[PDB]
Write a protein that binds this DNA or RNA. Sequence first.
RNA 1: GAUUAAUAGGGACAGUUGGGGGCAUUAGUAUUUAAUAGUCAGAGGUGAAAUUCUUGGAUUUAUUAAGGACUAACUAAUGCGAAAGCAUUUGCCAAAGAUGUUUUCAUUAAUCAAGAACGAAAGUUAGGGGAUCAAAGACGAUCAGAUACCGUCGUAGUCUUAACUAUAAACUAUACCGACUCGGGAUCGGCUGGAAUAAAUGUCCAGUCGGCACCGUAUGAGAAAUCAAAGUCUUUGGGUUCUGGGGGAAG
Lengths: 152, 80, 100, 152
Amino acid sequence: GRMQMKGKGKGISGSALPFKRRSPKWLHMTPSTVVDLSVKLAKKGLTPSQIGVILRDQHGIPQVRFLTGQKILRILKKNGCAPQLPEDLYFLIKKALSIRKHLEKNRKDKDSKYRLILVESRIHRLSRYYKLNQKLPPKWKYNAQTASALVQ
Amino acid sequence: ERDLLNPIYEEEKQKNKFKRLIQAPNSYFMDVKCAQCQNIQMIFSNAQSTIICEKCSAILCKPTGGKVQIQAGCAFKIKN
Amino acid sequence: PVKRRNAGRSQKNRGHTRTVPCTNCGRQVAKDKAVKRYTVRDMVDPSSKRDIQQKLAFENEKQGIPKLYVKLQYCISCAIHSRVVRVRCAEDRRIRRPPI
Amino acid sequence: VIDEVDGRNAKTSFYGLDITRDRLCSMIRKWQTLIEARVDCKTNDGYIIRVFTLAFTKKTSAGKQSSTSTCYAKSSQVRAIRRKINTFITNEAAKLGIAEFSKNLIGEDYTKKIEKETKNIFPLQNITIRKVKVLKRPKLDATKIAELYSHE
RNA sequence: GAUUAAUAGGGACAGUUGGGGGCAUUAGUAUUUAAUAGUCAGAGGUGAAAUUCUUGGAUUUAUUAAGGACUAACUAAUGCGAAAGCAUUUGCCAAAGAUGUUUUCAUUAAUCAAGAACGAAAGUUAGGGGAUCAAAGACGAUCAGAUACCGUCGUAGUCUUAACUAUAAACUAUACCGACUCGGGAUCGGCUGGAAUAAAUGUCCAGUCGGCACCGUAUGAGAAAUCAAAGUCUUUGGGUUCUGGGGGAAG
Ligand SMILES: [Mg+2]
Ligand SMILES: [Mg+2]
Ligand SMILES: [Mg+2]
Ligand SMILES: [Mg+2]
Ligand SMILES: [Mg+2]
Ligand SMILES: [Mg+2]
Ligand SMILES: [Mg+2]
Ligand SMILES: [Mg+2]
Ligand SMILES: [Mg+2]
Ligand SMILES: [Mg+2]
Ligand SMILES: [Mg+2]
Ligand SMILES: [Mg+2]
Ligand SMILES: [Mg+2]
Ligand SMILES: [Zn+2]
Ligand SMILES: [Zn+2]
């Protein structure tokens, strides 16, 4: 299953959403207060996902959308703090670059060259998606040098 | 004797969370009382990284692998 | 006609295993494939033992003559010829922990 | 090693420590992990020594160790065990003279202590000092070679 | 005015796990050689032997040193890696699975002509290096003949920088993603409870997720050997690349 690992890649990491869609009974936070916290965290430069984690561990908010009705990114969009490049793609490029970095120096390292090939492959593969779905500028390309100056 | 439609509780509890009928999670949320300043906070069962109580800044929980380590004299109750 | 399911070597979950020279000949053999027996023998014929144990200067020896430790590794041609291992019927062929 | 000739009899100073083949292959068993730990230390006596330590995985579970009764310790646990043994030795080395150090080394003191450090990480059996080498030995003044002789 | 949120997939994060990779470090005997001490007449090698080495003192003994390799024993129906392959210490660099998630994205996925990254060994080019073995070669022996099996030597090679080369019985001779069909212990990595103690990176017990396998068994398959897939095929259709059509000629 796990993408681009043929043969044995296949296993199940967890998350399982409970049945109750209604927010939990012990939870006393107004959806507005939540949107406030999430936006504060956001302006502090966090990720929709990282925000999710923070709200869940510290703040007793299990699922933000079952509280608000808006998923985290949509909230970020309406309220104007927006993560210009999708967190998703962002990390993939950060990675491909860390591999660039390490690889320019150790030029005899073959595994890391191959890993890079894989990661860049995924990056293009995500680009197509975010392009056809209008989440990325149409002429936007990942190059070594272009993407290195691209907010990553 | 077995019925797929009325599976037995003690069995489903034993099964992996994805292999149950309702596909229900194993995590909880807990109210935790700081040993020092006696503040109550909410903590996710498998919570990531570390938690410090907001009043006195002392350490409540430590991260692992799905367990959180409640540190020292911090008392807790599961919320449900 | 696959003869063994094992195919003779204990190796799975890897491409390659280190090669060992055979004790008897020195032929390179796979470390999985090799017939390996660990030997703890005594350096000396029991009679010879009597003779020596008479003459041992330090009386504080209780079994105070060392054993000889050998890790013996045979290629197949050798361990067959040399009878360390021998031909068995199809059914017995798969028997795993046999001795005494 | 002979530091001195006095009157038809040759005085000797410390040179090395070691082990019989027997007492080694005695201790080597299949189905446990063989730990080995090498250290480099200075005496205040002015000596540089290299100590090799040997240790084995101790089975607790109460069966006869076998193909079934596998005893291995995780490689990481091994590493922590090295780090700990090694550290302790360098400490107990810097504070002692070579007389002291050798006396302690030959005997069973260090084995006791080492088991006590090690046990958290993993229970160990027949801790041993496999060998000692003397890297760099100062020449002995008449004084210290007299103080080495000092016999009761 | 935004369907769920796939026991779909990507991403985040948390404690781990590994003989995965790249740099540095570092050890260890061993082979070979040298030095310094010793002692002497034989060492080697074989089925016997002979080539060899030996009084200029070999083999042998003790202590050092030089120089290239190599990681024993622990070492396993154990682990990792896409495969080739990967086993000494420590430090650094980037990478990875599985598990854990009441985190986020929301079909982003499967397979794949083009086109690309790898790819044992041997071999090739330009420098290094050269201890061990060792194609070619030189010799001994064996033999009717040995340009062979054995022995004494020995070059290229073996190791290394930069480069080529693209091949193996590169083997589970078994395509990849996905369902579903028996039973049982054990094993490696996570997690979840429980128990004992000398109270822990350790034991045991019961769960479970993922690995490598094994042992029974099939009123399932097969020409059989056999196969928990090589089953759910004339009761013939889940998705997708590849390959074969008597033997030689002939890769
Ligand atoms: Mg799956
Ligand atoms: Mg192979
Ligand atoms: Mg165990
Ligand atoms: Mg050396
Ligand atoms: Mg292992
Ligand atoms: Mg050359
Ligand atoms: Mg003749
Ligand atoms: Mg030779
Ligand atoms: Mg536990
Ligand atoms: Mg058929
Ligand atoms: Mg039949
Ligand atoms: Mg079977
Ligand atoms: Mg058909
Ligand atoms: Zn507090
Ligand atoms: Zn042999």
